[PDB]
Amino acid sequence: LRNNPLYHAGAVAFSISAGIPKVGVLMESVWNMNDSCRFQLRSPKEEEKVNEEQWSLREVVFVEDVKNVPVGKVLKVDGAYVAVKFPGTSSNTNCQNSSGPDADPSSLLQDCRLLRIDELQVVKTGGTPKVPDCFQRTPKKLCIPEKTEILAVNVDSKGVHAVLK
Amino acid sequence: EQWSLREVVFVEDVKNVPVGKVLKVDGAYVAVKFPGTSSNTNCQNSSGPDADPSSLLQDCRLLRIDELQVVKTGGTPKVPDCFQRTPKKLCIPEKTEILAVNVDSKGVHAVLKTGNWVRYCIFDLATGKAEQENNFPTSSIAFLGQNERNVAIFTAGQESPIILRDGNGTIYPMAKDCMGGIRDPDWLDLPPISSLGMGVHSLINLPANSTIKKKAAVIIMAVEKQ
């Protein structure tokens, strides 16, 4: 879909409140980084509600956009419209095994979304557009002034702090 | 051939009014299986349980909901038939006697007697009423002639001219005036006609560049020898 959010429901993130790092699964699609969204904390339906908090994305750091960036196979094209089978479109979560030859062919209709061609973006051999990782995997050099001696250093979210002689 | 719809009569609005069964609804978009949408005319037997599920997709059109109309238990909207299957009465004026009648696409043509008066009448089939009625400029007795049973109003067929006959067997020389009335009789100096033939004939024997049109009325006159 062309109208992709910044992060999708299901992305795993952590928030550091009260010094407790809390790990939670994003419950809704994020459209702007200055908003606040609900996260279900993860290690007859009250237990499902008991572990949601709403947090702002400043506080939250996404580890993974695990899922829910939707890629489907175009099963038909017609005029301005298209039929596309995406993973997870079936409201019947209990139909995870109808991949047999006896799959009621109405189920394949139930599985596919009907959209307009202009609402879709073609996925090329490079995969879906990756959200850039927020972990600086490799060491990055800092611009140390010349002819200076470093007496002490430390770190914080604010950046690097150092005493220079 | 390219035909002007004015001259065409549709016999039966046969087929090609496609009813589809809605197979899936997705917000404002829908998938509908309509008959004859499979470009593979050779898939007429894939109605088995092993029917490749992709074939069902190939068979159904994708549209928006606003482009569709629900078919109710009365079927598709019938185009009204152009053939008046049952007899329809015409609005005949009271106290009139009918001397002759004939037909054409223009409607019904009849000669009506009213006491000592004689009138020529054209009837509209939509309303059933006379579209125009005119008294003859000649004496009514002269039209009634020696034998009123001889009165007639012959036509060549469709799109035809009209030939009246009086009670003497004479062709009555009709013509409209510029007021919509009847001009003085432009006499023909003709003997009586015992019988007259009727029909329309093609003139395709003509060259395509002819000024004479590709149609004509053919009239055969059994003229009496005086």
Residue numbers in the entry:
A (entry chain B): 536 to 578, 640 to 761
B (entry chain C): 649 to 874
Question: What did the paper state?
Answer:
Here, we used genetic screens to identify the HECT-family protein ubiquitin protein ligase E3 component n-recognin 5 (UBR5) as the E3 ubiquitin ligase that governs agonist-induced degradation of numerous NRs and characterized these interactions biochemically and structurally. We next structurally interrogated functional domains in the context of full-length UBR5, which is expressed predominantly as a 310 kDa polypeptide product in humans. The N-terminal region of UBR5 arranges into a seven-bladed β-propeller, which shows weak homology to a regulator of chromosome condensation 1 (RCC1)-like domain (RLD). Following the RLD, a large helical region forms the core scaffold of UBR5.
We determined the structure of full-length UBR5 by cryo-EM, which, following further classification and refinement, reached ~3.9 Å resolution. Intriguingly, 2D class averages and the reconstructed 3D volumes showed a ring-like structure with distinguishable symmetric features. Size-exclusion multi-angle light scattering (SEC-MALS) identified a main species with a molecular weight of 1.385 MDa, consistent with a tetrameric assembly. The overall architecture of UBR5 is a closed and twisted ring with dihedral (D2) symmetry, held together by two distinct dimerization interfaces. A second dimerization interface holds together two halves of the ring and is markedly more flexible. Despite a lower local resolution in this region, the EM density map is consistent with the structure prediction from AlphaFold, showing tandem small beta bundles (SBBs), spatially separated but swapped in their primary sequences. In the context of the native tetramer, four SBBs link across the halves of the ring. In the structure of the UBR5 tetramer, the four HECT domains protrude towards the center of the ring cavity, separated by ~71 Å (within the same side of the ring) or ~91 Å (across opposite sides of the ring). Our 2D class averages consistently showed a blurry density in the middle of the ring. In the context of the full-length UBR5 tetramer, RARA/RXRA binds proximal to one UBR5 protomer, placing the NR within the ring, adjacent to the HECT domain of its dimerization partner and therefore also in the vicinity of the UBA domains.
